[PDB]
Design a protein around this motif. Structure first.
Motif, PDB file in Angstrom:
ATOM      1  N   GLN C  23      64.875  36.549  37.609  1.00 24.06           N
ATOM      2  CA  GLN C  23      65.241  37.834  38.194  1.00 24.06           C
ATOM      3  C   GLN C  23      66.236  38.583  37.316  1.00 24.06           C
ATOM      4  O   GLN C  23      66.229  39.819  37.292  1.00 24.06           O
ATOM      5  N   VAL C  24      67.055  37.864  36.546  1.00 26.69           N
ATOM      6  CA  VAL C  24      67.994  38.520  35.645  1.00 26.69           C
ATOM      7  C   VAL C  24      67.262  39.120  34.451  1.00 26.69           C
ATOM      8  O   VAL C  24      67.594  40.217  33.992  1.00 26.69           O
ATOM      9  N   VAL C  25      66.240  38.426  33.943  1.00 24.13           N
ATOM     10  CA  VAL C  25      65.416  38.987  32.875  1.00 24.13           C
ATOM     11  C   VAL C  25      64.667  40.217  33.372  1.00 24.13           C
ATOM     12  O   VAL C  25      64.518  41.209  32.647  1.00 24.13           O
ATOM     13  N   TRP C  26      64.187  40.175  34.616  1.00 20.75           N
ATOM     14  CA  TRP C  26      63.516  41.346  35.175  1.00 20.75           C
ATOM     15  C   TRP C  26      64.483  42.515  35.331  1.00 20.75           C
ATOM     16  O   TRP C  26      64.135  43.664  35.029  1.00 20.75           O
ATOM     17  N   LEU C  27      65.704  42.238  35.795  1.00 20.35           N
ATOM     18  CA  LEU C  27      66.721  43.281  35.890  1.00 20.35           C
ATOM     19  C   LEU C  27      67.055  43.844  34.513  1.00 20.35           C
ATOM     20  O   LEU C  27      67.318  45.044  34.369  1.00 20.35           O
ATOM     21  N   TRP C  28      67.045  42.989  33.489  1.00 18.80           N
ATOM     22  CA  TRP C  28      67.284  43.441  32.122  1.00 18.80           C
ATOM     23  C   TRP C  28      66.184  44.386  31.661  1.00 18.80           C
ATOM     24  O   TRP C  28      66.457  45.471  31.135  1.00 18.80           O
ATOM     25  N   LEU C  29      64.927  43.975  31.839  1.00 16.21           N
ATOM     26  CA  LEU C  29      63.803  44.826  31.460  1.00 16.21           C
ATOM     27  C   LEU C  29      63.839  46.151  32.212  1.00 16.21           C
ATOM     28  O   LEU C  29      63.467  47.195  31.663  1.00 16.21           O
ATOM     29  N   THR C  31      66.495  47.863  33.201  1.00 16.32           N
ATOM     30  CA  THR C  31      67.547  48.714  32.661  1.00 16.32           C
ATOM     31  C   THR C  31      67.378  49.006  31.176  1.00 16.32           C
ATOM     32  O   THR C  31      68.253  49.645  30.582  1.00 16.32           O
ATOM     33  N   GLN C  32      66.285  48.556  30.565  1.00 18.42           N
ATOM     34  CA  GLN C  32      66.064  48.801  29.146  1.00 18.42           C
ATOM     35  C   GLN C  32      65.794  50.280  28.900  1.00 18.42           C
ATOM     36  O   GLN C  32      64.916  50.876  29.532  1.00 18.42           O
ATOM     37  N   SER C  33      66.554  50.873  27.982  1.00 23.92           N
ATOM     38  CA  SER C  33      66.387  52.267  27.605  1.00 23.92           C
ATOM     39  C   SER C  33      66.277  52.370  26.092  1.00 23.92           C
ATOM     40  O   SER C  33      66.865  51.574  25.356  1.00 23.92           O
ATOM     41  N   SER C 100      66.838  46.453  19.652  1.00 27.87           N
ATOM     42  CA  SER C 100      65.526  46.803  20.174  1.00 27.87           C
ATOM     43  C   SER C 100      64.834  47.930  19.421  1.00 27.87           C
ATOM     44  O   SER C 100      63.620  48.093  19.587  1.00 27.87           O
ATOM     45  N   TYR C 216      77.520  53.449  22.529  1.00 27.15           N
ATOM     46  CA  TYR C 216      77.271  52.939  23.874  1.00 27.15           C
ATOM     47  C   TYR C 216      78.567  52.790  24.660  1.00 27.15           C
ATOM     48  O   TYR C 216      78.596  53.043  25.870  1.00 27.15           O
TER      49      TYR C 216
END
Ligand SMILES: CCCN(CCC)CCc1ccc(OC)c(OCCc2ccccc2)c1
Ligand SMILES: CCCN(CCC)CCc1ccc(OC)c(OCCc2ccccc2)c1
Ligand SMILES: CCCN(CCC)CCc1ccc(OC)c(OCCc2ccccc2)c1
Lengths: 220, 212, 220
Positions: C23-29, C31-33, C100, C216
């Motif tokens: 779920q943390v990897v999903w939250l990371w994806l 918020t990816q900008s 990225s 950032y």
């Protein structure tokens, strides 16, 4: 008639010595009874017939004829795969048709052209050109020769040359000798220059499929 | 036994002083313009005959500094992505003279050496692309290109290109670059041995000539 | 209240960290900008193609600094550094870099040929001048690209690449950039041994990361 009898223990040991000698001698003839699947100039004489066609149809008809001539020794359409090759500073592509511990046959070429080192194998390599140009510069000389479709470049064991393929060069290749040692060279740049481990897996899997075919043919 | 280290470092200091004085007071057998002019005189001849004439002339201009015919050998050289061939005429720890080229042409990295290198083209072309620039220069037979120490360029030899090379600097350091592709790209250990043996023969010649 | 086994609580904590990490990897994806759009760099670079590559590079750098302030390296940090990889050699000038994304001017004045590299990233190359020959894996043909065109290289794909003399292009890459940098320095370590070029490359990456981090954390 005591002089005609033979004890049992001496006879047992003598038969052990006899089978030892017989085995140590018939193991030698395994090198004398060596049998190559393809004749040395058969691949070249076969590919020189299809050189007039475009390399696609030439490859197709050559694979058909090679399966007809040597059934159970050529990989099926399910396992034929073009994989990249990066070695000695040059880059091309191969499609492995046959692979054993002493022989290998593969289509090989490049659509962009490439130059570099030929390598020093413990094997004899024949390359029969279907299309394009081949430039060979032998060691010790200061000149180079050019080979055209239909002609075959022979590369003896231990020799080292400089090679150059022009654009859209395609050939069949036959190799006789210590094939694993040559596989060692043909994956050097893939490890230290390109880092294309998927290509490494593809080449090793093609070799494994060729060996599986050569073993399942020997057993059936 | 504490004075044994003092004696060891004393002998070491005196030996390093000897070595420093010898390295400082050493002269050079050849000159850059000498090699350049010798290679330029023969640029109009076919490269075989030009090589032969230049070897004979170097032998007669500096006896005891050019390898004999029995030790002259062409050896392939794979380095920086390119592949040529060289024949070593003279090699010490501070200088070298060789014949270099390629019958097929080759492109790649010039190398980042600890030495100054001078190449006088007998035949062919030499395209040099200098670091930080976006254009390239071309040198033709008779011309000389200089590669300074610490410089890195891209190099391209056209088909059938041959030149005479005279290098001056820390020669053992170029061996790392010159044999990198031999170890990691070609796996040509026989050519590696041939190269090392040519270097050893040159060093043997120079040592025996200095000792007579 | 009761106890849990030594292997029971072990698997329970394994499942707990599995849920947390997934779920943390999903939250990371989520918020990816990305600073640049998927086709923004190509659309912008095609406008300057056809000019003198120096003028096109200058105008494109000015335009990128105008469109994305704080994401383009300053002039004092712009530097042409050689790149040796997959058997080929060229020169790069980095304008943007993160974990990225990255943007750079690339090209060669002599032309080169080699392995494109197999990345975990999607990389687009818009040609300003010269020619770009691409040979896709599994084919025996090649495609030529001229100034104004864009060559897209998908993640996991591997091709053979060739630049003609005086080839210059703009490049935008998106994905796991460190994995691409791992390939970008193969020949630098195992072929040229030019440690100064290695330092230049790593310093350019450090400067790009520093600019990205500063923007950032502090905007502008
Ligand atoms: C002129 C053509 C280049 N000539 C050098 C001859 C001068 C080598 C071409 C080659 C390609 C590719 C090769 O394999 C990657 C390869 O070595 C075969 C090893 C293997 C491979 C797969 C399965 C079993 C054995 C050799
Ligand atoms: C024309 C461009 C090539 N230029 C670059 C700078 C002008 C270098 C060519 C070179 C080839 C080959 C070289 O050696 C393989 C070599 O360094 C010689 C030093 C050595 C090493 C071992 C034994 C004896 C001498 C240099
Ligand atoms: C064959 C075309 C080249 N296409 C591959 C597309 C299939 C990549 C061009 C590139 C060169 C060289 C590269 O690195 C030298 C590089 O990666 C950039 C990331 C970085 C590197 C150093 C410092 C900061 C950021 C990318």
């Amino acid at each position: 008639s005591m002089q005609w009898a033979v004890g049992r223990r001496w006879a047992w040991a003598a038969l052990l010595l006899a089978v030892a000698a017989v085995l140590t001698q018939v193991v030698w003839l395994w090198l004398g009874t060596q049998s190559f699947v393809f004749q040395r100039e058969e691949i070249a004489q076969l590919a020189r017939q299809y050189a007039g066609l475009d390399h696609e149809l030439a490859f197709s008809r050559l694979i058909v004829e090679l399966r007809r001539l040597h059934p159970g020794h050529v990989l099926p359409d399910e396992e034929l795969q073009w994989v990249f090759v990066n070695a000695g500073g040059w880059m091309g592509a191969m499609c492995l048709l046959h692979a054993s511990l002493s022989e290998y046959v593969l289509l090989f070429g490049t659509a962009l052209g490439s130059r570099g080192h030929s390598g020093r194998y413990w094997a004899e390599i024949s390359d029969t050109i279907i299309s394009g140009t081949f430039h060979q510069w032998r060691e010790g000389t200061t000149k180079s020769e050019v080979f055209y479709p239909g002609e075959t470049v022979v590369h003896g064991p231990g020799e080292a040359t400089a090679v150059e393929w022009g654009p859209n060069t395609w050939m069949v290749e036959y190799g006789r000798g210590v094939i694993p040692s040559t596989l060692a060279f043909a994956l050097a740049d893939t490890v230290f220059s390109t880092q294309d481990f998927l290509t490494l897996f593809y080449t090793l899997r093609s070799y494994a499929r060729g060996l599986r075919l050569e073993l399942t043919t020997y057993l059936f």
